[PDB]
Design a binder for this molecule. Structure first.
Ligand code: A1ED4
Ligand code: CL
Length: 147
């Protein structure tokens, strides 16, 4: 039927079908379009108090809860999707990863390099697509596949 990970769902508020991807946590109204050895991704990480390393270049001790991090991630996605703000503008300013200085770019990578939830989301994204919140031991990511 649909590309890897995609499924139909019903909107609770509107009643229109939409599409949801249980690997990338992407969701969208439109039916998804149509694996490589490597992909290239950028990401925006929001760390929290249960992150493996509760520290980042933004904050020496990161104290926010997982739920507060998820709300930050959700707001960033809203601003990206609405075009009020660009993915790399937000990554540069707010990602708790050192790759913020590279606009969130992590470069090319193969399978078996990144943490598994990140890897799987990255390889299920089509070029140009963005994930929803992706949970790993580092925190919560928004992932943009650039190549
Ligand atoms: O493997 C997933 C992943 C990727 C990039 C990261 N930067 C900080 N923590 C990270 C975790
Ligand atoms: Cl880390």
């Amino acid at each position: 039927k649909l590309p890897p990970g995609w499924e139909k769902a019903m909107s609770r508020s509107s009643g229109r079908v939409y599409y949801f991807n249980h690997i990338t946590n992407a969701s969208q109204w439109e039916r998804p379009s149509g694996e490589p050895a490597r992909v290239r991704c950028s990401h925006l990480l929001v760390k929290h108090s249960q992150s493996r390393r509760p520290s980042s270049w933004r904050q020496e001790k990161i104290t926010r809860t997982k739920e507060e991090a998820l709300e930050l991630i959700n707001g960033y996605i809203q601003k990206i999707k609405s075009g009020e703000e660009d993915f790399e503008s937000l990554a540069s300013q707010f990602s708790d990863c050192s790759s913020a200085k590279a606009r969130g770019d992590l470069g090319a990578f193969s399978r078996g390099q990144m943490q598994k939830p990140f890897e799987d989301a990255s390889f299920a994204l089509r070029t140009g697509e963005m994930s929803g919140p992706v949970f790993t031991d580092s925190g919560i990511h928004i992932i943009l596949r650039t190549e």
